[PDB]
Each structure stands twice: as structure tokens, then as C-alpha cells.
Short mmCIF file of all heavy atoms in Angstrom, two decimals:
data_model
loop_
_atom_site.label_atom_id
_atom_site.label_comp_id
_atom_site.label_asym_id
_atom_site.label_seq_id
_atom_site.Cartn_x
_atom_site.Cartn_y
_atom_site.Cartn_z
N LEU A 1 -12.40 10.78 4.68
CA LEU A 1 -12.63 9.44 4.98
C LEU A 1 -13.49 9.32 6.24
O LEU A 1 -13.43 10.24 7.16
CB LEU A 1 -11.38 8.54 5.17
CG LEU A 1 -10.69 8.01 3.87
CD1 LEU A 1 -10.01 9.13 3.08
CD2 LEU A 1 -9.72 6.93 4.26
N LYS A 2 -14.15 8.18 6.43
CA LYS A 2 -14.92 7.97 7.65
C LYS A 2 -14.01 7.76 8.85
O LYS A 2 -12.83 7.33 8.62
CB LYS A 2 -15.87 6.76 7.49
CG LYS A 2 -16.88 6.86 6.32
CD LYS A 2 -17.89 7.87 6.64
CE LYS A 2 -18.88 8.04 5.51
NZ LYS A 2 -19.99 9.09 5.83
N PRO A 3 -14.43 8.03 10.00
CA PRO A 3 -13.64 7.77 11.24
C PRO A 3 -13.46 6.27 11.42
O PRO A 3 -14.38 5.51 11.04
CB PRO A 3 -14.44 8.38 12.36
CG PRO A 3 -15.27 9.45 11.72
CD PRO A 3 -15.61 8.94 10.40
N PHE A 4 -12.37 5.89 12.09
CA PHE A 4 -12.09 4.51 12.43
C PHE A 4 -11.99 3.68 11.20
O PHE A 4 -12.40 2.54 11.07
CB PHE A 4 -13.07 3.84 13.38
CG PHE A 4 -13.05 4.40 14.80
CD1 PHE A 4 -13.71 5.57 15.17
CD2 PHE A 4 -12.28 3.74 15.75
CE1 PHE A 4 -13.65 6.01 16.43
CE2 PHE A 4 -12.22 4.24 17.05
CZ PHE A 4 -12.92 5.36 17.36
N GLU A 5 -11.34 4.25 10.11
CA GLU A 5 -11.11 3.60 8.83
C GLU A 5 -9.67 3.64 8.49
O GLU A 5 -8.94 4.67 8.73
CB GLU A 5 -11.95 4.25 7.77
CG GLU A 5 -11.95 3.53 6.44
CD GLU A 5 -12.62 4.26 5.30
OE1 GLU A 5 -12.85 5.50 5.53
OE2 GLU A 5 -12.85 3.69 4.27
N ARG A 6 -9.14 2.52 7.99
CA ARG A 6 -7.74 2.44 7.62
C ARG A 6 -7.60 2.54 6.09
O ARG A 6 -8.34 1.89 5.34
CB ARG A 6 -7.16 1.06 8.07
CG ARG A 6 -5.63 0.95 7.95
CD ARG A 6 -5.14 -0.43 8.25
NE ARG A 6 -5.13 -0.62 9.76
CZ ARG A 6 -5.99 -1.37 10.42
NH1 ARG A 6 -7.06 -1.90 9.80
NH2 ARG A 6 -5.88 -1.57 11.72
N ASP A 7 -6.64 3.37 5.69
CA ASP A 7 -6.40 3.57 4.22
C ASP A 7 -5.08 3.03 3.87
O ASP A 7 -4.00 3.57 4.28
CB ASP A 7 -6.52 5.02 3.89
CG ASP A 7 -6.57 5.27 2.40
OD1 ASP A 7 -6.88 4.35 1.62
OD2 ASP A 7 -6.29 6.46 1.94
N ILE A 8 -4.95 2.01 3.09
CA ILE A 8 -3.74 1.35 2.68
C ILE A 8 -3.49 1.43 1.21
O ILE A 8 -2.58 0.65 0.68
CB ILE A 8 -3.64 -0.10 3.28
CG1 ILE A 8 -4.71 -0.97 2.62
CG2 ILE A 8 -3.66 -0.19 4.77
CD1 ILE A 8 -4.39 -2.42 2.50
N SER A 9 -4.20 2.23 0.51
CA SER A 9 -4.10 2.30 -0.96
C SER A 9 -2.74 3.03 -1.27
O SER A 9 -2.61 4.24 -1.08
CB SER A 9 -5.25 3.06 -1.55
OG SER A 9 -5.55 4.31 -0.84
N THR A 10 -1.83 2.29 -1.89
CA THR A 10 -0.52 2.82 -2.29
C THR A 10 -0.67 3.28 -3.71
O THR A 10 0.01 2.75 -4.63
CB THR A 10 0.56 1.76 -2.19
OG1 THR A 10 0.26 0.55 -2.90
CG2 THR A 10 0.65 1.33 -0.68
N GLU A 11 -1.50 4.31 -3.97
CA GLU A 11 -1.75 4.72 -5.33
C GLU A 11 -1.20 6.17 -5.45
O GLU A 11 -1.71 7.00 -4.75
CB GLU A 11 -3.28 4.68 -5.56
CG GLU A 11 -3.69 5.00 -7.02
CD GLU A 11 -3.88 6.45 -7.31
OE1 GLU A 11 -4.56 7.12 -6.55
OE2 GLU A 11 -3.15 6.90 -8.24
N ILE A 12 -0.33 6.33 -6.37
CA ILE A 12 0.42 7.59 -6.58
C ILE A 12 -0.47 8.76 -6.89
O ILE A 12 -1.11 8.79 -7.90
CB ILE A 12 1.56 7.46 -7.58
CG1 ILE A 12 2.18 8.77 -7.92
CG2 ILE A 12 1.07 6.63 -8.82
CD1 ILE A 12 3.54 8.64 -8.69
N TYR A 13 -0.52 9.79 -6.03
CA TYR A 13 -1.56 10.79 -6.07
C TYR A 13 -1.12 11.88 -7.10
O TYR A 13 0.07 12.03 -7.46
CB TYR A 13 -1.74 11.41 -4.65
CG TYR A 13 -3.00 12.18 -4.57
CD1 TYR A 13 -4.16 11.52 -4.18
CD2 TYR A 13 -3.05 13.61 -4.73
CE1 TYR A 13 -5.36 12.17 -4.04
CE2 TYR A 13 -4.20 14.31 -4.52
CZ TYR A 13 -5.35 13.59 -4.28
OH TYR A 13 -6.57 14.32 -4.05
N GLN A 14 -2.13 12.65 -7.59
CA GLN A 14 -1.90 13.74 -8.56
C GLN A 14 -3.02 14.80 -8.23
O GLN A 14 -4.02 14.44 -7.61
CB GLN A 14 -2.00 13.19 -9.93
CG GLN A 14 -1.63 14.27 -10.99
CD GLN A 14 -1.84 13.78 -12.45
OE1 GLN A 14 -2.97 13.85 -13.00
NE2 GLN A 14 -0.88 13.39 -13.07
N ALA A 15 -2.77 15.99 -8.64
CA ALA A 15 -3.83 17.00 -8.68
C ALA A 15 -5.00 16.46 -9.55
O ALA A 15 -6.14 16.62 -9.18
CB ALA A 15 -3.24 18.25 -9.27
N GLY A 16 -4.75 15.74 -10.62
CA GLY A 16 -5.69 14.87 -11.32
C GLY A 16 -5.53 13.52 -10.78
O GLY A 16 -4.94 12.59 -11.34
N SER A 17 -6.12 13.35 -9.49
CA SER A 17 -5.90 12.06 -8.81
C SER A 17 -6.58 10.89 -9.49
O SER A 17 -5.98 9.78 -9.52
CB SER A 17 -6.49 12.25 -7.37
OG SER A 17 -7.93 12.26 -7.39
N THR A 18 -7.77 11.14 -10.08
CA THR A 18 -8.47 9.98 -10.66
C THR A 18 -7.91 9.50 -12.00
O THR A 18 -7.92 8.30 -12.17
CB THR A 18 -9.99 10.30 -10.75
OG1 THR A 18 -10.20 11.29 -11.79
CG2 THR A 18 -10.49 10.88 -9.40
N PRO A 19 -7.35 10.31 -12.92
CA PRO A 19 -6.73 9.73 -14.08
C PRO A 19 -5.38 9.10 -13.72
O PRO A 19 -5.08 7.93 -14.19
CB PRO A 19 -6.55 10.87 -15.02
CG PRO A 19 -6.59 12.10 -14.23
CD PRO A 19 -7.55 11.80 -13.04
N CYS A 20 -4.47 9.76 -13.00
CA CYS A 20 -3.21 9.26 -12.70
C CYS A 20 -3.33 8.14 -11.62
O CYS A 20 -3.47 8.46 -10.48
CB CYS A 20 -2.28 10.36 -12.22
SG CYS A 20 -0.47 10.04 -12.25
N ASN A 21 -3.33 6.90 -12.07
CA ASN A 21 -3.41 5.75 -11.20
C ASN A 21 -2.36 4.73 -11.46
O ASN A 21 -2.30 4.19 -12.55
CB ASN A 21 -4.82 5.07 -11.38
CG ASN A 21 -5.84 5.63 -10.33
OD1 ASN A 21 -5.78 6.70 -10.00
ND2 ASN A 21 -6.60 4.67 -9.82
N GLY A 22 -1.45 4.54 -10.54
CA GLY A 22 -0.31 3.62 -10.74
C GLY A 22 0.71 4.00 -11.73
O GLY A 22 1.50 3.23 -12.24
N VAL A 23 0.72 5.30 -12.19
CA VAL A 23 1.57 5.86 -13.23
C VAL A 23 2.19 7.12 -12.76
O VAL A 23 1.67 7.66 -11.77
CB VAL A 23 0.80 6.03 -14.62
CG1 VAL A 23 0.36 4.74 -15.15
CG2 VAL A 23 -0.36 7.02 -14.38
N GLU A 24 3.29 7.57 -13.34
CA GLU A 24 3.94 8.74 -13.03
C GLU A 24 3.72 9.77 -14.02
O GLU A 24 4.22 9.71 -15.24
CB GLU A 24 5.50 8.43 -12.80
CG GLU A 24 6.32 9.61 -12.48
CD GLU A 24 5.73 10.54 -11.45
OE1 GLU A 24 6.02 10.28 -10.23
OE2 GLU A 24 5.08 11.54 -11.74
N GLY A 25 2.93 10.82 -13.68
CA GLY A 25 2.50 11.85 -14.62
C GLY A 25 2.71 13.27 -14.10
O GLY A 25 3.49 13.46 -13.10
N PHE A 26 2.06 14.16 -14.68
CA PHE A 26 2.27 15.62 -14.41
C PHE A 26 1.74 15.91 -12.97
O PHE A 26 0.56 15.75 -12.70
CB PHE A 26 1.51 16.50 -15.40
CG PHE A 26 1.69 16.06 -16.84
CD1 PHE A 26 0.69 15.37 -17.49
CD2 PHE A 26 2.85 16.44 -17.50
CE1 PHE A 26 0.83 14.99 -18.83
CE2 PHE A 26 2.96 16.01 -18.82
CZ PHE A 26 1.97 15.31 -19.47
N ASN A 27 2.63 16.43 -12.19
CA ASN A 27 2.31 16.74 -10.75
C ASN A 27 1.88 15.52 -9.97
O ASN A 27 1.15 15.54 -9.01
CB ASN A 27 1.37 17.86 -10.65
CG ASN A 27 1.90 19.21 -11.00
OD1 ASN A 27 3.05 19.57 -10.71
ND2 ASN A 27 1.05 20.02 -11.71
N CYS A 28 2.19 14.32 -10.47
CA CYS A 28 1.74 13.08 -9.85
C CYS A 28 2.78 12.52 -8.92
O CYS A 28 3.75 11.94 -9.32
CB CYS A 28 1.44 12.07 -11.02
SG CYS A 28 0.33 10.67 -10.53
N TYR A 29 2.58 12.77 -7.61
CA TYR A 29 3.55 12.39 -6.63
C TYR A 29 2.85 11.43 -5.59
O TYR A 29 1.71 11.70 -5.30
CB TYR A 29 4.16 13.54 -5.92
CG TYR A 29 4.55 14.66 -6.88
CD1 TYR A 29 3.86 15.95 -6.85
CD2 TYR A 29 5.65 14.61 -7.71
CE1 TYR A 29 4.22 16.95 -7.65
CE2 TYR A 29 6.01 15.59 -8.54
CZ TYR A 29 5.29 16.80 -8.52
OH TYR A 29 5.66 17.79 -9.36
N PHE A 30 3.63 10.39 -5.19
CA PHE A 30 3.10 9.41 -4.40
C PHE A 30 2.65 9.91 -3.05
O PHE A 30 3.43 10.68 -2.37
CB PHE A 30 4.23 8.32 -4.15
CG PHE A 30 3.71 6.97 -3.65
CD1 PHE A 30 3.02 6.12 -4.41
CD2 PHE A 30 4.02 6.62 -2.30
CE1 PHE A 30 2.59 4.93 -3.89
CE2 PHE A 30 3.51 5.37 -1.81
CZ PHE A 30 2.79 4.53 -2.65
#
């Protein structure tokens, strides 16, 4: 991310970050 930037996205992360969005999947941890 760029410096002096705030990240407030409460989007549950995954190794496959871009498919797993707002869902609970394989290795998908918040």
C-alpha cells in the first residue's frame, strides 16, 4: 500500500485472496 494510507477493508483474507471475498473458504482467515 501507499504511505499515509488507511486500510479499513474488513474482507476475510485467503491464499486465494481475490476469489474468497466475504466468505469462509479453504485457508480463508480474516
Side-chain angles (χ1 to χ4, degrees):
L1 276 75
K2 300 293 183 181
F4 290 85
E5 189 188 12
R6 190 186 282 103
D7 193 19
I8 62 151
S9 46
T10 59
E11 190 275 304
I12 170 167
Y13 200 84
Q14 189 186 80
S17 74
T18 74
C20 198
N21 265 37
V23 294
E24 176 48 86
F26 315 102
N27 290 318
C28 200
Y29 316 111
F30 196 72

